[PDB]
Structures are given as C-alpha cells and as structure tokens.
Short mmCIF file of C-alpha atoms (C1' of nucleotides) and ligand atoms in Angstrom, two decimals:
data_model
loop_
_atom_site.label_atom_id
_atom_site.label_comp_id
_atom_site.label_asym_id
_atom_site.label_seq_id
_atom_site.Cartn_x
_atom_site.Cartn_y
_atom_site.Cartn_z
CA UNK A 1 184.67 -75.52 8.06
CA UNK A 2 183.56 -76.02 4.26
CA UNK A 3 182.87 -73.13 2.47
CA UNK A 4 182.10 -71.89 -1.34
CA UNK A 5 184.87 -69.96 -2.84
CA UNK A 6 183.31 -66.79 -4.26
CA UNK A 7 186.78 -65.88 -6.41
CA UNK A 8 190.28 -67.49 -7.19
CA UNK A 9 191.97 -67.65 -4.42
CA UNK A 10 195.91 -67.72 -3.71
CA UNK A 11 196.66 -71.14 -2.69
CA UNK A 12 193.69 -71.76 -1.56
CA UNK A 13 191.34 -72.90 -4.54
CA UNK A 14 189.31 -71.14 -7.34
CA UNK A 15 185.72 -69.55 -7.55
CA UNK A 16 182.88 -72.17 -7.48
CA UNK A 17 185.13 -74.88 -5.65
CA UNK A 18 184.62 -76.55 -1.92
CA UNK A 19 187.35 -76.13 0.19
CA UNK A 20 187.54 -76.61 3.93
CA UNK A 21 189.20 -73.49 6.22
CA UNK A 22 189.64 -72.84 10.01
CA UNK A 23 186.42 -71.24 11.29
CA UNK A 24 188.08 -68.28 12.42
CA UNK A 25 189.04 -67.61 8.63
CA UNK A 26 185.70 -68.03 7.10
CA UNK A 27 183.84 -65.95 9.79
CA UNK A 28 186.12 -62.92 9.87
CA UNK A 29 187.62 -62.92 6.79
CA UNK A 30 186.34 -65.20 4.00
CA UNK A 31 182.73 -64.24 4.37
CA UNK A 32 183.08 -60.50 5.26
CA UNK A 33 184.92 -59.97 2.43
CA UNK A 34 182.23 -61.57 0.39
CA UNK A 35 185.47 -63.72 -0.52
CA UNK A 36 183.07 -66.42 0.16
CA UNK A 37 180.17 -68.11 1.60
CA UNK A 38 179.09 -71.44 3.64
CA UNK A 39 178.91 -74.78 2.46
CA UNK A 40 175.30 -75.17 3.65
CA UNK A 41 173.30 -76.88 1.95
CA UNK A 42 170.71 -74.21 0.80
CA UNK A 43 173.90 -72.69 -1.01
CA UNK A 44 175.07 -76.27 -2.15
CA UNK A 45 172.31 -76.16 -4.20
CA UNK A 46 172.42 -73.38 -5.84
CA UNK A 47 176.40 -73.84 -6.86
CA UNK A 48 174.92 -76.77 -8.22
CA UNK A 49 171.99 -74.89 -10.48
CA UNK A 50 174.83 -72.65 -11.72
CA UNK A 51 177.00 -75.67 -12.89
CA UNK A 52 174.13 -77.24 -14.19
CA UNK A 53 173.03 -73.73 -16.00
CA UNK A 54 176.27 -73.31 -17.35
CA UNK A 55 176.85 -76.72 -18.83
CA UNK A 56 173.22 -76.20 -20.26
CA UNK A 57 174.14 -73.00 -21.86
CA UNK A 58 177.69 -74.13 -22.93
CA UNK A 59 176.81 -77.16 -25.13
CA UNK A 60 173.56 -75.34 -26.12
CA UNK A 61 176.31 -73.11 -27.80
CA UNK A 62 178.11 -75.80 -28.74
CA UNK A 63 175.45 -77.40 -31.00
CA UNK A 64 174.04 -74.51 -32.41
CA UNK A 65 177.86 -74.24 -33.87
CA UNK A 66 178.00 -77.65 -34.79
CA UNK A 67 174.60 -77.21 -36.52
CA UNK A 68 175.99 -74.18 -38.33
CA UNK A 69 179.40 -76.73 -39.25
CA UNK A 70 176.14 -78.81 -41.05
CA UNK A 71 174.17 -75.84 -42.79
CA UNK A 72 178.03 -74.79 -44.47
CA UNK A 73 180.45 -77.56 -44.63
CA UNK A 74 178.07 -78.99 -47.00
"C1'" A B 1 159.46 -97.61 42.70
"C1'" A B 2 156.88 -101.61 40.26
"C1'" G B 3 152.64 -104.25 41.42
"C1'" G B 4 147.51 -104.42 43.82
"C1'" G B 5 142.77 -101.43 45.63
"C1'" G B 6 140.30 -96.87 44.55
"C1'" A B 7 138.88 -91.48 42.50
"C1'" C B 8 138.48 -89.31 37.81
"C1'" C B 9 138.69 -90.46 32.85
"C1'" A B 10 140.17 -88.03 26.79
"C1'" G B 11 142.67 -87.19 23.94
"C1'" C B 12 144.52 -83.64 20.31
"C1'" C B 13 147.36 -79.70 17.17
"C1'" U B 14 151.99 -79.28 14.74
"C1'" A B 15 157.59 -79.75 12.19
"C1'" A B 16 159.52 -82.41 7.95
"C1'" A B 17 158.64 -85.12 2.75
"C1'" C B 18 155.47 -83.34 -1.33
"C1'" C B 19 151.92 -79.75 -3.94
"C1'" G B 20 150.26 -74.71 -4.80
"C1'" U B 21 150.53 -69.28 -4.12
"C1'" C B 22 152.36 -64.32 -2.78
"C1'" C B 23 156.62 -61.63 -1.74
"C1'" G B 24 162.05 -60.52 -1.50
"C1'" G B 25 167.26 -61.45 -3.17
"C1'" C B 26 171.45 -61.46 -7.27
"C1'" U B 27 175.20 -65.46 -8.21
"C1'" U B 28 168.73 -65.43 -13.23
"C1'" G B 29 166.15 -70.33 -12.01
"C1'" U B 30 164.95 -77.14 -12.34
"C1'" C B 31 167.70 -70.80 -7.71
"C1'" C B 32 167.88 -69.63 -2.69
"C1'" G B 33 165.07 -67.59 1.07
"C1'" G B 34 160.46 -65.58 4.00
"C1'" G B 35 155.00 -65.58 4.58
"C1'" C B 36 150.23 -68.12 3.62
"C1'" G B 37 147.32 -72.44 2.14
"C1'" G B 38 147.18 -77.66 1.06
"C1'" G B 39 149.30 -82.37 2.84
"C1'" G B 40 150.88 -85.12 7.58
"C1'" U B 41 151.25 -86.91 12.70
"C1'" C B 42 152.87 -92.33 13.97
"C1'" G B 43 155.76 -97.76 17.08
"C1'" U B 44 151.34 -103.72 14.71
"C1'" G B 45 156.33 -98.15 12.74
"C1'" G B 46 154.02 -93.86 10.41
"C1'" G B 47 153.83 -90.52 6.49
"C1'" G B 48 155.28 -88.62 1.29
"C1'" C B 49 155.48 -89.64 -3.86
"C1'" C B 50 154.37 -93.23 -8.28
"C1'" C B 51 150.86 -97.71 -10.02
"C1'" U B 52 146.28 -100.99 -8.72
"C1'" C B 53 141.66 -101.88 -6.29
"C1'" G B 54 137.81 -99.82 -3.13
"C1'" G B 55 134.25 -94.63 -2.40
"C1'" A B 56 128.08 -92.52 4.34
"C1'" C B 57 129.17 -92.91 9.88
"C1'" C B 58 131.63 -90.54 14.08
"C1'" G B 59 132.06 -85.92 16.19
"C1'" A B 60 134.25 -81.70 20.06
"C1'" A B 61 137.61 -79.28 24.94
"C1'" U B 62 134.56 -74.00 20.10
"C1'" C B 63 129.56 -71.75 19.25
"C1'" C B 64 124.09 -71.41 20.20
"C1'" C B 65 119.41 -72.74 22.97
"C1'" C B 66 117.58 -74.87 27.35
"C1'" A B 67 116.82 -77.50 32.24
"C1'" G B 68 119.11 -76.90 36.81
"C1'" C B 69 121.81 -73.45 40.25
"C1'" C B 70 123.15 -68.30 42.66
"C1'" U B 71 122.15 -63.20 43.48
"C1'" A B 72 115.56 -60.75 46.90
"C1'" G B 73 111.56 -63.60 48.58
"C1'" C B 74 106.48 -66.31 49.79
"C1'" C B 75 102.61 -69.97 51.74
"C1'" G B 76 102.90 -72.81 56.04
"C1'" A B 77 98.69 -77.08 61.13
"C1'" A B 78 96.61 -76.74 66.19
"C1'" G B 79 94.18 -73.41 73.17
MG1 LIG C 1 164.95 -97.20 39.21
MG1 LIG C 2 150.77 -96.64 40.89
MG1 LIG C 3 146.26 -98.23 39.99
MG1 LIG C 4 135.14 -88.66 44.98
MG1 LIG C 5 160.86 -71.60 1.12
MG1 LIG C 6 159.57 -71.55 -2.89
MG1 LIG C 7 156.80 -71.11 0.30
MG1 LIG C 8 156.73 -97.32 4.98
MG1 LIG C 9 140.09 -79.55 20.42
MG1 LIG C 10 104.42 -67.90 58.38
MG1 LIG C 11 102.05 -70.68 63.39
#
RNA sequence: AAGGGGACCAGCCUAAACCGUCCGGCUUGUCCGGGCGGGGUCGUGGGGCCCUCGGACCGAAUCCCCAGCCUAGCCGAAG
C-alpha cells in the first residue's frame, strides 16, 4: 500500500515522500496516528500543489535576493 | 436456441471530461472535498477541449381542454 509520509520517519522515509507499507501498518498505525495518509490520487495532488507552492515561494525568495545582490553590489 | 409466421411497437435520463457557483477543511490554493447548475450520452465509436466553416423544423411517456366510455334512466309497432 502507497501512502504519503506526514513526518520523518525512522527507516522508513521523510515527510512529503511516497513510500509503500503493509496495509495492516497504514490502516492501524500510519494513518491513526496522523503519521500519514493514502496515496490516492485526490491527495497526490495536493502533495504536488505544496511542492509546486514551495518551489514558487523559494526562488521567489531567491530572486528578490539576487535583485537586492543588483541594487548593492553596484 | 437461432431462424420463419404473428401481436404490439418507442425510446429515453444519467456518470465522467470540461465550465461556473455556493459551502466546508488545514497541509493556504493552479488545493482537496461536498452540494447545485451548465455540458454529455455513444459502436459508422461517442463526447470534452482548442482552431475553421455553417446558424427554423421535430416534439413527449408531463400538463390542460375535449370527443368517447362508466356510475341512474327514457321512447319504443300491431286484436
Ligand atoms: Mg448457446
Ligand atoms: Mg424469436
Ligand atoms: Mg419474429
Ligand atoms: Mg390482439
Ligand atoms: Mg468537487
Ligand atoms: Mg471545486
Ligand atoms: Mg463543485
Ligand atoms: Mg474522437
Ligand atoms: Mg420522457
Ligand atoms: Mg315501453
Ligand atoms: Mg308493446
């Protein structure tokens, strides 16, 4: 069974990656712990709107730097 | 059972893509999810979306009116 890590995770993986577990794990474990969550694909998504939000907000920093390195520097 | 002879005869609505709207969630949006509306319905495959060209007839199984019919009757030849 696939499922979303929610946190880092002892030998297991870290928060945000796809890893695949024994169902028996995931249901009464995993997910009741909110350790984690199902790989479906209505949740697939949205891990992939957070990457994609991050990496927006990330090199939106890192040009508004770089644009300050042009403002001084000179 | 197919096929043949007959009876009767009639075909439709959705889900999904995609568009819009309300509402809820926390892991804040190019988010996910629920409701509603739009769209769509097929086997020569059909639909969606993006270009190009083109721009009144059919019609209910729902509704309304009516004929007809039922629920009482009546006239009815000549010792
Ligand atoms: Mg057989
Ligand atoms: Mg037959
Ligand atoms: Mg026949
Ligand atoms: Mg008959
Ligand atoms: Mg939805
Ligand atoms: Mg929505
Ligand atoms: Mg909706
Ligand atoms: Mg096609
Ligand atoms: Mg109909
Ligand atoms: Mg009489
Ligand atoms: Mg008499």
């Amino acid at each position: 069974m696939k499922v979303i890590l929610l946190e880092p995770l002892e030998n297991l993986g870290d928060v945000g990656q796809v890893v695949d577990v024994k169902p028996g794990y995931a249901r009464n474990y995993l997910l009741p712990r909110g350790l984690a969550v199902l790989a479906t694909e209505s949740n697939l998504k949205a891990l992939e709107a957070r990457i994609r939000a991050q990496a927006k907000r990330l090199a939106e920093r890192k040009a508004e730097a770089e644009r300050l390195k042009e403002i001084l520097e000179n």
